[PDB]
Write a protein that binds this DNA or RNA. Structure first.
Ligand SMILES: [Mg+2]
Ligand SMILES: [Mg+2]
Ligand SMILES: [Mg+2]
Ligand SMILES: [Mg+2]
Ligand SMILES: [Mg+2]
Ligand SMILES: [Mg+2]
Ligand SMILES: [Mg+2]
Ligand SMILES: [Mg+2]
Ligand SMILES: [Mg+2]
Ligand SMILES: [Mg+2]
Ligand SMILES: [Mg+2]
Ligand SMILES: [Mg+2]
Ligand SMILES: [Mg+2]
Ligand SMILES: [Mg+2]
Ligand SMILES: [Mg+2]
Ligand SMILES: [Mg+2]
Ligand SMILES: [Mg+2]
Ligand SMILES: [Mg+2]
Ligand SMILES: [Mg+2]
Ligand SMILES: [Mg+2]
Ligand SMILES: [Mg+2]
Ligand SMILES: [Mg+2]
Ligand SMILES: [Mg+2]
Ligand SMILES: [Mg+2]
Ligand SMILES: [Zn+2]
Lengths: 158, 50, 53, 203, 122, 118, 86
RNA sequence: CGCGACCUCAGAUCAGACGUGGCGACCCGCUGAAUUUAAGCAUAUUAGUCAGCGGAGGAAAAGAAACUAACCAGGAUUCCCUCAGUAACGGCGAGUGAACAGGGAAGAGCCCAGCGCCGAAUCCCCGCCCCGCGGCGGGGCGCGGGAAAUGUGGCGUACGGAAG
């Protein structure tokens, strides 16, 4: 029995909805649990970047968003083989790889290769055994000046 | 029934010993609430199941 | 004799390979070289048996 | 290798060679009982594709499921209710006969664990299937690090949660635009995520 | 007098049974004294003798199995009593050896490509 | 071999006896129904003492898992006296009553003075 | 006749006390129980009566083993050791 | 006729292990109504809901594209905000109704069969010795027994791979 004037409307409450209701009273409990887990992970990987590995410049698809630039899944292996980083060693030293991504372009590939080289210039690789250094390795006086950075490694500006 | 089986006579033997009242020193205890045996059973009134 | 079911099953399978029109790709395994040739083949092949444990 | 030849051989099922073999095996398997142990696979290539390795502990059963649809198990007609639900005999079951064949042997051997299963023969009134099983407490698999995943207690009765290759295919499960109604874990997890109110604290 | 579990452990196997049946006899005589009408000095002692029976039988049943699981410990097949009775799922979890052992392809992968300790600059 | 009978039956095969590589239990279970905990106490009612005097017998309460042979061997081990016969019933409270009729050269009143009932 | 008169003819009992659930529902002619379903291996249990389940779920009786495993859990099922003597 | 292999198939109180049943709030597979709404009612709706059955774990399931897209392209799964009460479905009536994209939480990838190449290079069990043994394991010796060529292990799997 609708009254004089107003929207005629379709509330989706014809099902039994009170049995399936999600109350969010553990919202601050999860916002404490996540940051406790995050502090524990950031202590556990002790000099390593707290956000995780490095993730590439990508364009969005789908006409509404292609002007913008996101962080992607991982560095494409075509973008790795011309940066000189091996596809297995990248994930060890902290470079996210996905093999699924193609490279339609050349500008994006050169930007990601420049990004990988600018990253590889900045990592401080500790020796795999602390007493004896090796060739693919950083100097001893640079080891004391390492620290975890916060936020994403080389944050993507548009 | 004077032809009882052993488990039925076993059952009746326990339900007979449970019909004994409280011992009268129980209501001399400190933290006691029990005035009398309340789960008593008279053989006319309640017919025990079985 | 009322034989058990596995004996009757295998004997009736052996009879069905006689009844049914067997294709030549399976008929070709019936023709085996005779026992004067098989002993020659096995006396040659006994020379080159692989080593055991 | 011989497995490519016998794979392409078993692909030509309409041929006279494999037609003779299928009808002889179907006669034999129809004469024999409902759920018995085969000593070795009839399809040695297909068993190796699905996961079987000829080592101590993998056990192959061939079982027959009785072929046909599923009429509604109801007294005489008499499915009480509206004329939508008056269907009795042209109803079809949600899972497949191969999945039923997996779970019948998986229930008959509760100690063992159903790995996968395949097709051996058929006639008008039965399907036959060789379901291959793994004995999860044998030391030839509990000391093998790439098949000791099935010895873990998570994978008890894969055939009855529907986690095998032929039990999976009735869950509507997959990536795509064709499988929107199962994103989440299942078509029940999809339904449950969709038909709730996320009543937040603030709103 | 007051029998306790310390000094019973040094006694040998027949001496403990020779004390056991003596305590059995004393418990039976105290039951007869309970029925005929006896003093509270004995109807209190009727608990002491039962717990004395228990204190002796505990020492027999402990020393018997302390001998048995030292007899059976070098062997691969122990009886089900001597086997460790934790929960049923963890008596059939994979053990510390066969959970630890890795396939050699994964040994080559974690040999050639170990996770490195590193840090990046700001 | 000639098949005389037109039926086939299962041929009798060999089968070995249990030779286990470890016993299931570690040690045999202790006999909890022994000659002390099989006899709880003797009665001291007037219907039991009148039974003791003339009939030359003893009246005991035993637990309900005991045979008459077990009560006979138990009384002969405990009080080292021969037993003529044993009559058992189960009382309505649920525990077994035994009537140990003694040998005629053994009086019940003297062995009652021995065991403590008067 | 169907009432007070016909209530006299009842002497032969239908049920008896079962030997698994202990309740008096063991139907003598069917030889099966009404509350637990005795000769079936699985317990008779339906959740159209939560009030029939919570009469005997796990929290009802002795828990004479699960009580002990609830306090052996809180040391990680430490077994075979004894505490250090005096 | 016998003796011996193999193949199918029995028998055991044979040696050693494994499954059964319960709780079932959360999870998985199936079966699955009617009240109710449509101011009647039959399609729809309630609803893949209640009840029924099977199976678990500390989480389960899912999961590393036979994907989304149509862009200057993104890139396993799951969850949240949103798309959206939208596209759509529906006696187009009542009602029903997702996804892609974007922002976040988290983030991890991998392994066989096949094609091949290495003298089965592989695995299980029992016997003896040394160590440890209340998660039965490490080594040595067995002209000791089996499995396996009707294919075990090593390399190798779509990101290619092998050999020289
Ligand atoms: Mg109005
Ligand atoms: Mg009356
Ligand atoms: Mg309808
Ligand atoms: Mg899975
Ligand atoms: Mg399909
Ligand atoms: Mg009747
Ligand atoms: Mg049940
Ligand atoms: Mg045995
Ligand atoms: Mg169960
Ligand atoms: Mg209506
Ligand atoms: Mg109305
Ligand atoms: Mg109406
Ligand atoms: Mg529906
Ligand atoms: Mg339900
Ligand atoms: Mg559990
Ligand atoms: Mg899982
Ligand atoms: Mg892929
Ligand atoms: Mg997505
Ligand atoms: Mg209309
Ligand atoms: Mg709907
Ligand atoms: Mg999205
Ligand atoms: Mg983040
Ligand atoms: Mg491999
Ligand atoms: Mg191979
Ligand atoms: Zn019952």
């Amino acid at each position: 029995a609708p009254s004089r004037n107003g929207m005629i409307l379709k509330p989706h409450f014809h099902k039994d909805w009170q049995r399936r209701v999600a109350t969010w009273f553990n919202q601050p409990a999860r916002k404490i649990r996540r940051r406790k887990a995050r502090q524990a992970r950031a202590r556990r990987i002790a000099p390593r970047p707290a956000a995780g590995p490095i993730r590439p410049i990508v364009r969005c698809p789908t006409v509404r968003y292609h002007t913008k630039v996101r962080a992607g899944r991982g560095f494409s292996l075509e973008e790795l083989r011309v940066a000189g980083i091996h596809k297995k060693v990248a994930r060890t030293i902290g470079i996210s790889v996905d093999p699924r991504r193609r490279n339609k372009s050349t500008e994006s590939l050169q930007a990601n290769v420049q990004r990988l080289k600018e990253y590889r210039s900045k990592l401080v690789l500790f020796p795999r055994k602390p007493s004896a250094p090796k060739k693919g390795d950083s100097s001893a006086e640079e080891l004391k000046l390492a620290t975890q950075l916060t936020g994403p490694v080389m944050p993507i500006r548009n | 029934s004077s032809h009882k089986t052993f488990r039925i006579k076993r059952f009746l033997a326990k339900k007979q010993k449970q019909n004994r009242p409280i011992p009268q020193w129980i209501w001399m205890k400190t933290g006691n609430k029990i005035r009398y045996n309340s789960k008593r059973r008279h053989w006319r009134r309640t017919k025990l199941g079985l | 004799v009322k034989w058990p079911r596995y004996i009757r099953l295998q004997r009736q399978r052996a009879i069905l390979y006689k009844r049914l029109k067997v294709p030549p790709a399976i008929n070709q395994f019936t023709q085996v070289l005779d026992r004067q040739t098989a002993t020659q083949l096995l006396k040659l092949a006994h020379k080159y048996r692989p080593e055991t444990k | 290798g011989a497995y490519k030849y016998i794979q392409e051989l078993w692909r030509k099922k309409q041929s006279d060679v494999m037609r003779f073999l299928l009808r002889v095996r179907c006669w034999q398997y129809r004469q024999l009982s409902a759920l018995h142990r085969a000593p070795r696979p009839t399809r040695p290539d297909k068993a190796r594709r699905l996961g079987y390795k000829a080592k101590q502990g993998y056990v192959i059963y061939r079982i027959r499921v009785r072929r046909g649809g599923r009429k509604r198990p109801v007294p005489k007609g008499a499915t009480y209710g509206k004329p939508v639900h008056h269907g009795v005999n042209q109803l079809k079951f949600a899972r497949s006969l191969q999945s039923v064949a997996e779970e019948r042997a998986g229930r008959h051997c509760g100690a063992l664990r159903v790995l996968n299963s395949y097709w051996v023969g058929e006639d008008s009134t039965y399907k036959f299937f060789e379901v291959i099983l793994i004995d999860p407490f044998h030391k030839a698999i509990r000391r093998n690090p790439d098949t000791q995943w099935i010895t873990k207690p998570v994978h008890k009765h894969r055939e009855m949660r529907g986690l095998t290759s032929a039990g999976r295919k009735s869950r509507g499960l997959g990536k795509g635009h064709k499988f929107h109604h199962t994103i989440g874990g299942s078509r029940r997890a999809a339904w449950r995520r969709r038909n709730t109110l996320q009543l937040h604290r603030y709103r | 007098a007051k029998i306790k579990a310390r000094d019973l452990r040094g006694k040998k196997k027949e001496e403990l049974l020779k004390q056991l049946d003596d305590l059995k006899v004393e418990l039976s005589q105290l039951r007869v004294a309970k029925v005929t009408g006896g003093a509270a000095s004995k109807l209190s002692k009727i608990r002491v003798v039962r717990k004395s029976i228990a204190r002796v039988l505990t020492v027999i049943n402990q020393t018997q199995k302390e001998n048995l699981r030292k007899f059976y410990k070098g062997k691969k097949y122990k009886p089900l009593d001597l086997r460790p009775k934790k929960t049923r799922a963890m008596r059939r979890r994979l053990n510390k050896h066969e959970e630890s052992l890795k396939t050699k392809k994964q040994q080559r992968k974690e040999r050639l490509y170990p996770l490195r300790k590193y840090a990046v600059k700001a | 071999k000639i098949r005389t009978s037109p039926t086939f039956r299962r041929p009798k095969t060999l089968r070995l006896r249990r030779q286990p590589k470890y016993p299931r239990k570690s040690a045999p279970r202790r006999n909890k129904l022994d000659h002390y905990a099989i006899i709880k106490f003797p009665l001291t009612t007037e219907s039991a003492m009148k039974k003791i005097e003339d009939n030359n017998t003893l009246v005991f309460i035993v637990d309900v898992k005991a045979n008459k042979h077990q009560i006979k061997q138990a009384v002969k081990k405990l009080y080292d006296i021969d037993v003529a016969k044993v009559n058992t019933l189960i009382r309505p409270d649920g525990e077994k009553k035994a009537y140990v009729r003694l040998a005629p050269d053994y009086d019940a009143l003297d062995v009652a003075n021995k065991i403590g009932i008067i | 006749t169907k009432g007070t008169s016909s209530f006299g003819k009842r002497r032969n009992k239908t049920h008896t006390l079962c030997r698994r659930c202990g309740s008096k529902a063991y139907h003598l002619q069917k030889s099966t129980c009404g509350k637990c379903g005795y000769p079936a291996k699985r317990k008779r249990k339906y959740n159209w009566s939560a009030k029939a389940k919570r009469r005997n779920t796990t929290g009802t009786g002795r828990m004479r083993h699960l009580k002990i495993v609830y306090r052996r859990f809180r040391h990680g099922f430490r077994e075979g050791t004894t505490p250090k003597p005096k």
